[PDB]
Design an enzyme around this catalytic site. Structure first.
Site, short mmCIF file in Angstrom:
data_model
loop_
_atom_site.label_atom_id
_atom_site.label_comp_id
_atom_site.label_asym_id
_atom_site.label_seq_id
_atom_site.Cartn_x
_atom_site.Cartn_y
_atom_site.Cartn_z
N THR A 186 41.88 44.97 31.44
CA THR A 186 42.60 45.83 32.42
C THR A 186 44.00 46.17 31.94
O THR A 186 44.71 45.32 31.40
CB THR A 186 42.71 45.16 33.83
OG1 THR A 186 41.40 45.00 34.39
CG2 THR A 186 43.51 46.00 34.78
N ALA A 233 38.05 40.90 39.79
CA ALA A 233 37.61 42.11 40.49
C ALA A 233 37.48 41.91 42.00
O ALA A 233 37.96 42.73 42.78
CB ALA A 233 36.30 42.60 39.91
C1 LIG Z 1 38.04 46.52 41.36
C2 LIG Z 1 38.32 45.86 40.01
C3 LIG Z 1 37.31 45.77 39.05
C4 LIG Z 1 37.58 45.18 37.81
C5 LIG Z 1 38.86 44.68 37.55
C6 LIG Z 1 39.16 44.03 36.21
N1 LIG Z 1 38.65 42.65 36.14
C7 LIG Z 1 37.50 42.35 35.56
O1 LIG Z 1 36.75 43.17 35.03
C8 LIG Z 1 37.17 40.87 35.55
C9 LIG Z 1 37.66 40.27 34.22
C10 LIG Z 1 37.30 38.79 34.06
C11 LIG Z 1 38.14 37.89 34.96
C12 LIG Z 1 39.51 37.78 34.75
C13 LIG Z 1 40.28 36.96 35.58
C14 LIG Z 1 39.66 36.25 36.61
C15 LIG Z 1 38.28 36.36 36.82
C16 LIG Z 1 37.52 37.19 36.00
N2 LIG Z 1 35.71 40.70 35.70
C17 LIG Z 1 35.15 40.25 36.81
O2 LIG Z 1 35.77 39.93 37.81
C18 LIG Z 1 33.63 40.14 36.74
C19 LIG Z 1 32.97 41.44 37.19
C20 LIG Z 1 31.48 41.39 36.88
N3 LIG Z 1 30.68 40.32 36.74
C21 LIG Z 1 29.44 40.73 36.46
C22 LIG Z 1 28.21 39.81 36.24
C23 LIG Z 1 27.25 40.05 37.41
C24 LIG Z 1 28.66 38.34 36.22
C25 LIG Z 1 27.49 40.17 34.95
N4 LIG Z 1 29.40 42.07 36.42
O3 LIG Z 1 30.74 42.52 36.70
N5 LIG Z 1 33.12 39.02 37.56
C26 LIG Z 1 33.25 37.76 37.16
O4 LIG Z 1 33.81 37.42 36.12
C27 LIG Z 1 32.68 36.69 38.09
C28 LIG Z 1 32.10 35.55 37.70
C29 LIG Z 1 31.75 34.88 38.79
C30 LIG Z 1 31.04 33.52 38.85
O5 LIG Z 1 32.09 35.59 39.89
N6 LIG Z 1 32.70 36.77 39.41
C31 LIG Z 1 39.87 44.77 38.50
C32 LIG Z 1 39.60 45.37 39.73
#
Ligand SMILES: Cc1ccc(CNC(=O)[C@H](CCc2ccccc2)NC(=O)[C@H](Cc2nc(C(C)(C)C)no2)NC(=O)c2cc(C)on2)cc1
Lengths: 233, 212, 250, 235, 232, 241, 198, 236
Positions: free
Chosen positions: B1, B49
């Site tokens: 991000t 997210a």
């Molecule tokens: C609206 C919106 C969307 C996307 C963003 C950007 N973040 C992101 O893209 C973050 C980056 C990783 C992260 C960083 C810090 C803390 C936790 C996770 N990713 C995210 O939260 C992912 C989203 C996601 N997960 C998935 C699957 C189904 C696991 C394959 N598909 O999409 N969920 C996770 O990491 C997650 C994992 C668990 C357990 O619960 N949520 C910001 C705002």
């Protein structure tokens, strides 16, 4: 003798009566009329709604409880909400935990027990509403009468509310006719409409005046109001 | 991000990317990382997210409630502090969010607050937040002038996101552009990096690190 | 179930009386007479053991009770109320004082604590005041010998000598006449036995009289030797035999 | 704790009525000290006077109270006031300002007035104390939870009589020894006994402690009251 | 004099009946429901000319599509409004849509049941629009009962007001007609002369939501009413 | 758990505990407030059961809530301390969460709210207090004056009075206060206040007290002598045949 | 580690606090005020864990302002610092302690002395002629041990701090982006808003 | 929680009146079990026959029937059921009848101790077969209960009690379960004499060691008709 013995529900009179409960029972007589009747395939509710003004609504008196069960009310409407809500939960709990549609008879026992507590706990008050409960379960069609005293009875037909004795008299005589209206919803509804009539010095029952609900063998619980009831006047 | 917001002569520019990942899996390229709170308030989302989406959607609910109670748009200071106070209640339980609350009010003028799940709340002119923040800062800091024309500030923001989309593996998708004035926010479109990169390369003559 | 009387049963009347406390004092008046006399080397507390039928065992009823090794109590009014107060007082001497300071409380402070328990029943929801007056006699290293009276309201006050119950008026007068600030303990025992002869109707012997002193330390009532830095309890119930011996030369 | 049609609080009014039968206490405030005088309720020869305390209570080192009402009800309130003072000292490393301690006790009283269905405490207090903001202070509180500040004041029995006399003889530039005299003289004329003797009085002074610049609390012993009764001409 | 939730021998709840009496002593509130909107008007009733009239809030917004007028012990209405607002915003939070007017009312009436030591001394007219059932008017009593009305009046002048609403209401009233009628019927029942300072108008339209009319737009309609009723 | 309902309805629809609370207000010493063009003035009176009082240390009738808002009351003094404490706690709490001091309207709404709650909770009696709350919103110049009562109703007033003989003084204010022309000077606004109090108090000696609030947390109490300068100017000059 | 310095001269107390706010690999802000006015003659400076730092300062501020308005009176620096200490000493044994260190600089008007109190997150209080929290103390304590005099003027105290800051710019690993300086004397609290390029 | 000056509890006393006012119900002990029976007033032709069951089972081995306020009875049985469950959970064996009696005893009695609760307006007849025999019990609104050879409560209690007394005297050897079922049908018919303004339905249940293996079962079909017939015979 009637003196300090109607203070609360937690007091017996020297006769052995519970006046608060008797008074709550009195809220029903003052309530608008409703009728229930069943054959072996369907059960029906007919509720004459009451308005406040010519400009007001005819307050809804039939509440759905599950796909196979529901009730009509006469008395304090808020109290019908508390109890039917509790019934929605008990139906729901039966579905989730046991994958079982809740038996009408059990619904009766449950309502009885809930009302009972309020006839015995200090600072509480008896429920001020009577309820007619129809349902279709694994033993067929059912009608139940709920009294706020906690008394529930299973019947072929009945009526509660203002001038209910008229409809109850008619039903006591039409018995052998309607019980045999199997696999023919519209005639059972008609028999309900004609039963509610024997309880009107009031007037002609009209389009917004009438409420019908039905549940049956391959028919889930559904309420009809207005346009849909026009064919029954 | 990568998300950024800067203040300038003609208001506030807010720009964000649109990529969601799980580990090295690119989960989505079309995610909306800006929340429109009311016509005068924006929030940006970086980190988890769900955390971001949930609590900022909630922030909108709490801001609407303030309007009804006090017959008045909430201040940016107080909107940010609702988020900031909530997040502080949860400190230690592992929430992950870094956000900017941006908007105009008559009392404050254009304002930006950075709020993160550590409980940090800062007022400032320039913020970039997320895994791509350093890439953004580099472009942004070395082209930022207070006197930028609306047109040029819009581009600067857009270009800074492009910068971070390119170099950061966990950034990309598209750019969403917003401009915030006294009249409220105005959306300045979605811009696929797929298309934007090539256009910018040819027109600006930059990205000479890139083949073809 | 559940306490549903959450308000005070002792309230103010328009004249400023607290009815229930007055009525509790009336109950005390019906009570069998009891007294305490403070000497220069001791304190004596005494009462009558009003038996109900000669089939009752008088010794099995405690009218004079040990509260701490140096403190005693006697009462007038409702026996069952006294008995539960003695239990709560013994317990509080521990929870509020011995478990904190490693030594038993001084008389005024234990009295202060009983006073508290009785006041509480004067103001708490759903309760009536205790129907007793207590006489508490004791000693502590820093205040020496003392004697206090606690009433249904939780009021307490110190006395050189006093009596409570049925024949309290008559006895207060009798003591006033006989009390001087130079009395030995045996003198005060003697005066106590004389004052108590008035109260009582029937028999007047050691099996109808309960009498205890707070005097010198009794090493043979400790139960162990070897720690020379305590000689033991100052509280001492007089035996039936000891009472009679003083009654012959009376 | 309910209102009359008139807008007064039944249990409170009746509590004040209760207090009006209690031994009188007076507080007088000088330029250089406060006097606390109180009269014991129809007593006896056998009542121990030496180790007796019932009307004058030390709250901390800078503040004392005089009690008119239910002795036991006052024991409760004194104990929680003592605790509040220690809480304040622990929190701030400074002795509690008189007013603050007074306000807290009054707020406790006010509670019973407004909620809980318990009876008010049948107690009135005169507070004598010193702090470095306002110097010497005299306050009063009653079961309504009301508190006011005074140059001189009395509570309990015969306050009308006593109040008349204090206004007649008090003047701002008073010294402590004159205030002592005034206290005893006022009690002499408002007593119900034949005459005022030593075993019927409790007496206390909050002075500036001769030569030091530090505050002293003195609770007069039996023999000391007996003496100060001689000098004034009451023997 | 025995209890709060006690039944009378006629099967009514004492306290609920007595709260209804309090409402009768309240300032008049009138609501008219049309096909172009729903109008709510009230009687300010300053207890003195020194009272700043526009500080009398007897019409309050609940959500952009739902407004409400009160009558009775208006102080008791505070926590009902607060609860109403929370219910409408919470619904939007959980479902990403506007709450139904009937659901909002049902929720307020749920709150009404929770006697809290006593029933509310206030009744509410709740008006708004939703996609399903269009423009709606609701009367919510402290019994927990609520009723839908084409037109309704609550407060001291309500008996005469209702009668007048009975003649004048038909299923084709334009919004501007409905505004004039609220103003007219208020003028009749108010113990004072109706001007822009002692009466307040408001409406909800699908397009513009709930708007309180400012004193200037009201004064115009008062002037327009005086004239419409001069020629006839 | 004492929750016995004390504030209940009567057959005619009145809550008698709330009603008798009003009676306690009308028993209390008079308090008045009047707002000017650039100011608001609050005025009180004192009783005469005893006058060997110490005035340095006795609770004044005008209380500061925040540095820009003040509250004066008629009714039970002990009750008012409780409403003031809560108002003070809220004022700090609003600064902490909203990063702005309260508006006068907001603080008023809060206090009125607390009063209301006490009219419908088990085992509590309403406040025997009605209040005047005055000051200026932060960064605003338009003066604000509000009144609350034991029921929880609140409203704003060009000028208002409460407590014993307020019927009389509200009479005076209703004829004298011009909506067209508010007392444009601080001075002449203190004039209308002392006049209105003179009808009830007697000599404006050790009894009448006054407080002035200007914008930006400018709040000054008066001294006996500066009051006496107003007592004098009206008596002699408005004595003319 | 953020820089929190305090020096008590003869007539005032001076606080210098670092302007940088750094999360991770970025300096997010170069103009942060790590200070809350507690009352007109009492100022608190703070360093420690990210969110805890401001939440604590502002909670302490709310409590002191409340007390002032309730008593129409200003608490002494000795009193405020005891309030704060006890608050921290409570926090240290709770479910989640406040990880904040503070300097409290006040002018006691009753005594006419200026006062400097150093308090760490554990609730360890001490009064000092000069103080510091974090690594910065490892340089300043000895420097001030040498250059400080009990009877210095406010202008002299500011030259003493200049040494301290310059030393910290020579030897500390991180760019703390200069300091905001504030003086607490008899006239209250003011900012020397021109310390950086001077 | 109020004694009247004669030492009785006037609220319990009024509860009794409410019982005396109820439908009549009985229990008869036999030599290896117990039979229960009740009078069901036919309020209306609209009542569904056999469908408003008054008798209730507790655990698997205990029968309960009552007269008075029917809701009060149901509350009691619910509690009896929890008290049965709780006993079985802890001690494995099903609850002995004397033990089950004291469980209801103490509970009913508790509702005579406090001013904020009213006593129960039922008398309950209950029993069954446990490890050492059959047991019959009746429990009054005060919580008073005893064992019985025969028991009756309700509007027709006196006429029913007299009939029971006759059987006890004329069958010192013991009665049979099969027989007691017929006799119970007779007794309810005789007892209906003091309540005859309404038509009635008969309901009978039993718990016999040899006829039900010591489990509670309702009397339906063939055996119920034989009992009605026998009772119809000795009334013509
Ligand atoms: C609206 C919106 C969307 C996307 C963003 C950007 N973040 C992101 O893209 C973050 C980056 C990783 C992260 C960083 C810090 C803390 C936790 C996770 N990713 C995210 O939260 C992912 C989203 C996601 N997960 C998935 C699957 C189904 C696991 C394959 N598909 O999409 N969920 C996770 O990491 C997650 C994992 C668990 C357990 O619960 N949520 C910001 C705002």
């Amino acid at each position: 003798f009637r003196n300090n013995y109607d203070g609360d529900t937690v007091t017996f009179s020297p006769t052995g009566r519970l006046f608060q409960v008797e008074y709550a029972l009195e809220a029903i007589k003052q309530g608008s009329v409703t009728v229930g009747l069943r054959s072996n395939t369907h059960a029906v509710l007919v509720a004459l709604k009451r308005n406040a003004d010519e400009l007001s609504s005819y307050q809804k008196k039939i509440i759905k409880c599950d796909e196979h069960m529901g009730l009509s009310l006469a008395g304090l409407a808020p109290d019908a909400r508390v109890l039917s809500n509790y019934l929605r939960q008990q139906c729901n709990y039966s579905s989730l935990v046991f994958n079982r549609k809740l038996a009408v008879e059990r619904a009766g026992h449950l309502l009885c027990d809930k009302a009972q507590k309020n006839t015995q706990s200090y600072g509480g008050r008896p429920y001020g509403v009577g309820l007619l409960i129809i349902g279709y379960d694994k033993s067929g069609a059912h009608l139940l009468e709920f009294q706020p005293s906690g008394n529930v009875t299973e019947l072929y037909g009945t009526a509660i509310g203002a001038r209910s004795q008229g409809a109850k008299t008619y039903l006591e005589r039409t018995l052998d006719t309607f019980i045999k209206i199997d696999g023919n919803p519209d005639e059972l509804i008609k028999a309900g409409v004609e039963a509610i009539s024997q309880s009107l010095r009031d007037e002609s029952l009209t389009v917004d005046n009438l409420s019908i609900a039905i549940v049956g063998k391959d028919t889930p619980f559904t309420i009809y109001d207005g346009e849909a009831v026009a064919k029954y006047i | 991000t990568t998300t950024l917001a800067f203040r300038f002569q003609g208001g506030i520019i807010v720009a964000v990317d649109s990529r969601a990942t799980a580990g090295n899996w690119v989960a989505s390229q079309t995610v909306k990382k800006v929340i429109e709170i009311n016509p005068f308030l924006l929030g940006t989302m970086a980190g988890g997210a769900a955390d971001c989406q949930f609590w900022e959607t909630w922030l909108g609910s709490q801001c609407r409630l303030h309007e009804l109670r006090e017959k008045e748009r909430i201040s940016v200071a107080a909107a940010s502090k609702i988020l900031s106070n909530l997040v502080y209640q949860y400190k230690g339980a592992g929430l992950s969010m870094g956000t900017m609350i941006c908007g105009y009010t008559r009392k404050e003028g254009p304002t930006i607050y950075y709020v993160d799940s550590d409980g940090t709340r800062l007022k400032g002119d320039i913020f970039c937040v997320g895994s791509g923040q350093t890439f953004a800062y580099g472009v942004l800091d070395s082209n930022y002038k207070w006197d930028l024309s609306v047109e040029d500030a819009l581009y600067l923001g857009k270009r800074s996101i492009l910068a971070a989309a390119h170099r950061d593996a966990y950034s990309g998708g598209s750019v969403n552009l917003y401009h915030v004035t006294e009249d409220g926010w105005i959306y300045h479109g979605n811009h696929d990096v797929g298309e934007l990169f090539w256009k910018v390369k040819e027109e600006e003559g930059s990205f000479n690190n890139v083949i073809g | 179930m559940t306490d549903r009387y959450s308000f005070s049963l002792t309230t103010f009347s328009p004249s400023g009386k607290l009815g229930q406390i007055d009525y509790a004092l009336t109950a005390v008046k019906q009570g069998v007479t009891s007294l305490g006399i403070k000497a220069t080397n001791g304190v004596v507390i005494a009462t009558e053991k009003k038996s109900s039928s000669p089939l009752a065992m008088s010794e099995t009823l405690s009218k004079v009770s040990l509260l701490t090794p140096d403190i005693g109590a006697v009462y007038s009014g409702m026996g069952p109320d006294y008995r539960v107060l003695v239990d709560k007082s013994r317990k509080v001497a521990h929870t509020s004082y011995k478990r904190i300071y490693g030594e038993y409380p001084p008389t005024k402070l234990l009295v202060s604590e009983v006073a508290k328990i009785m006041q509480e029943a004067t103001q708490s929801g759903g309760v009536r005041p205790f129907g007793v007056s207590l006489l508490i006699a004791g000693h502590d290293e820093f205040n020496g010998f003392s004697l206090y009276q606690v009433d249904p309201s939780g009021s307490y006050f110190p006395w050189k000598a006093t009596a409570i119950g049925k024949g309290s008026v008559a006895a207060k007068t009798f003591l006033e006449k006989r009390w001087n600030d130079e009395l030995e303990l045996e003198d005060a025992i003697h005066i106590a036995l004389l004052t108590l002869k008035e109260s009582v109707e029937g028999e007047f012997n050691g099996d109808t009289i309960e009498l205890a002193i707070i005097g010198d330390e009794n090493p043979d009532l400790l139960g162990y030797t070897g720690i020379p830095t305590d000689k033991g309890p100052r509280f001492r119930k007089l035996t039936s035999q000891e009472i009679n011996d003083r009654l012959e030369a009376l | 704790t309910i209102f009359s049609p008139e807008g007064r609080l039944y249990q409170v009014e009746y509590a004040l009525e209760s207090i009006s039968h209690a031994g009188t206490a007076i507080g007088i405030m000088a330029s250089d000290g406060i006097v606390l005088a109180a009269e014991r309720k129809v007593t006896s020869t056998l009542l121990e006077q030496d180790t007796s305390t019932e009307k004058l209570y030390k709250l901390n080192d800078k503040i004392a109270v005089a009690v008119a009402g239910l002795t036991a009800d006052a024991e409760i309130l004194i104990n929680t006031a003592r605790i509040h003072a220690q809480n304040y000292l622990k929190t701030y490393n400074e002795d509690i300002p008189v007013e603050i301690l007074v306000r807290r006790l009054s707020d406790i009283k006010q509670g019973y007035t407004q909620h809980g269905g318990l009876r008010p405490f049948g107690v009135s207090f005169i507070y004598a104390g010193y702090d470095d903001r306002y110097g010497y202070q005299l306050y009063t509180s009653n079961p309504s939870g009301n508190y006011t500040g005074w140059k001189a004041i009395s509570v309990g029995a015969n306050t009308s009589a006593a109040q008349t006399l204090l206004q007649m003889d008090y003047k701002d530039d008073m010294k402590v020894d004159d205030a002592i005299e005034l206290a005893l003289k006022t009690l002499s004329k408002t007593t119900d006994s034949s005459a005022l003797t030593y075993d019927r009085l409790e007496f206390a002074t909050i002075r500036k402690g001769a030569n030091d610049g530090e505050v002293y609390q003195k609770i007069f012993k039996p023999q000391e009251i007996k003496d100060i009764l001689v000098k004034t001409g009451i023997t | 004099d025995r209890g709060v939730s006690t039944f009378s021998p006629e099967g009514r709840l004492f306290q609920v009946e007595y709260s209804l009496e309090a409402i009768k002593l309240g300032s008049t509130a009138i609501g008219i429901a049309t096909k172009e909107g729903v109008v709510l008007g009230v009687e300010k009733r300053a207890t003195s000319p020194l009272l700043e009239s526009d500080s009398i809030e007897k019409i309050v917004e609940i959500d952009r599509h739902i407004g409400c007028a009160m009558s009775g012990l208006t102080a008791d209405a505070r926590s009902m409004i607060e609860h109403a607002r929370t219910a409408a915003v919470t619904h939007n939070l959980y479902y990403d849509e506007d709450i139904n007017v009937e659901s909002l009312t049902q929720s307020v009436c749920d709150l009404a049941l929770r006697f809290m030591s006593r029933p509310f001394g206030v009744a509410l007219l709740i008006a708004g629009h939703d996609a399903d059932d269009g423009y709606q008017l609701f009367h919510a009593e402290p019994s927990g009962t609520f009723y839908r009305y084409n037109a309704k009046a609550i407060g001291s002048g309500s008996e005469g007001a209702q009668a007048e609403l009975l003649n004048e209401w038909h299923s084709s009233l334009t919004l501007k007609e409905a505004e004039l009628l609220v103003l007219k019927i208020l003028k009749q029942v108010m113990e004072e002369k109706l001007d822009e300072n002692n009466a307040q108008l408001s409406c909800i339209t699908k397009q513009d939501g709930f708007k309180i009319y400012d004193n200037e737009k009201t004064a115009e309609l008062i002037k327009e009413l005086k004239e419409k009723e001069a020629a006839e | 758990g004492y929750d016995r309902a004390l504030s209940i309805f009567s057959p005619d629809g009145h809550i008698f505990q709330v009603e008798y609370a009003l009676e306690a207000v009308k028993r209390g010493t008079c308090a008045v407030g009047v707002k000017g063009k650039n100011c608001v003035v609050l005025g009180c009176e004192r009783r005469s059961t005893l006058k060997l009082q110490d005035t340095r240390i006795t609770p004044s009738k005008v209380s500061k809530i925040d540095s820009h808002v003040v509250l004066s009351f008629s009714g039970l003094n002990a009750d008012s301390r409780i409403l003031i404490e809560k108002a003070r706690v809220e004022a700090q709490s609003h600064r902490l969460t909203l990063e702005d001091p309260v508006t006068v309207e907001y603080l008023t709404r809060y206090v009125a709210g607390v009063q209301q709650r006490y009219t419908q909770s088990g085992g509590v009696r309403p406040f025997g207090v009605s209040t005047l709350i005055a000051g200026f919103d932060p960064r605003d110049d338009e003066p604000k004056l509000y009144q609350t009562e034991p029921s929880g109703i609140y409203s704003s007033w060009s000028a208002q009075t409460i407590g014993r003989n307020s019927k009389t003084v509200r009479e005076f204010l209703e004829k004298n206060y011009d909506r067209k022309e508010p007392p444009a000077t601080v001075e002449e606004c203190v004039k209308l206040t002392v006049r209105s109090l003179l009808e009830v108090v007697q000599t404006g000696a050790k009894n009448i007290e006054i407080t002035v609030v200007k914008p930006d947390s400018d709040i000054v109490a008066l001294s006996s002598e500066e009051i006496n300068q107003y007592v004098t100017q009206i008596e002699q000059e408005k004595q003319e045949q | 580690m953020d820089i929190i310095l305090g020096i008590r001269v003869q007539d005032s107390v001076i606080l210098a606090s670092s302007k940088a706010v750094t999360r991770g690999i970025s300096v997010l802000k170069d103009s942060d005020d790590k200070t809350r006015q507690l009352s007109p003659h009492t100022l608190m400076s703070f360093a420690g864990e990210a969110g805890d730092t401001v939440q604590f300062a502002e909670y302490i501020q709310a409590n002191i302002q409340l007390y002032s308005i309730r008593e129409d009176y200003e608490l002494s620096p000795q009193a405020v610092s005891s309030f704060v200490r006890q608050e921290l000493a409570k926090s240290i044994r709770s479910r989640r302690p406040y990880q904040v260190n503070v300097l409290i600089g006040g002018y006691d008007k009753k005594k006419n002395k200026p006062e400097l109190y150093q308090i760490d997150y554990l609730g360890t209080k001490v009064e000092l002629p000069y103080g510091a929290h974090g690594y910065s103390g490892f340089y300043t304590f000895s420097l001030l041990d040498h250059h400080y005099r009990p009877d210095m003027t406010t202008e002299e105290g500011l030259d003493l701090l200049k040494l301290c800051v310059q030393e910290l710019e020579k030897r500390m690993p991180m760019d703390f982006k200069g300091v905001i300086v504030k003086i607490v004397d008899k006239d209250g609290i003011r900012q020397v808003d021109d310390f950086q390029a001077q | 929680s109020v004694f009247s000056p004669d030492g009785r509890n006037f609220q319990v006393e009024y509860a009794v009146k409410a019982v005396e006012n109820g439908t009549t119900s009985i229990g008869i002990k036999c030599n290896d079990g117990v039979v229960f029976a009740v009078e069901k007033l036919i309020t209306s032709k609209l009542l569904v026959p056999q469908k408003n069951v008054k008798i209730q089972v507790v655990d698997r081995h205990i029968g309960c029937v009552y007269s008075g306020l029917i809701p009060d009875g149901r509350h009691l049985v619910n509690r009896g059921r929890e008290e049965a469950a709780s006993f079985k959970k802890l001690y494995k064996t099903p609850i002995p009848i004397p033990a089950f009696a004291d469980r209801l005893g103490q509970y009913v009695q508790a509702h005579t101790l406090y001013n904020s609760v009213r006593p129960f307006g039922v008398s309950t007849i209950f029993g069954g077969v446990d490890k050492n025999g059959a047991h019959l019990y009746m429990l009054e609104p005060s919580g008073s209960y005893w064992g019985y050879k025969g028991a009756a409560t309700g509007k027709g209690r006196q006429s029913a009690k007299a009939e029971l007394e006759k059987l006890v005297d004329h069958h010192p050897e013991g009665l049979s379960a099969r027989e007691a079922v017929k006799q119970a049908a007779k007794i309810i018919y005789l007892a209906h004499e003091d309540n005859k303004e309404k038509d009635f339905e008969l309901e009978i249940s039993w718990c016999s060691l040899s006829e039900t293996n010591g489990l509670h079962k309702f009397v339906k079909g063939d055996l119920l008709q034989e009992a009605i017939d026998f009772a119809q015979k000795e009334i013509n």
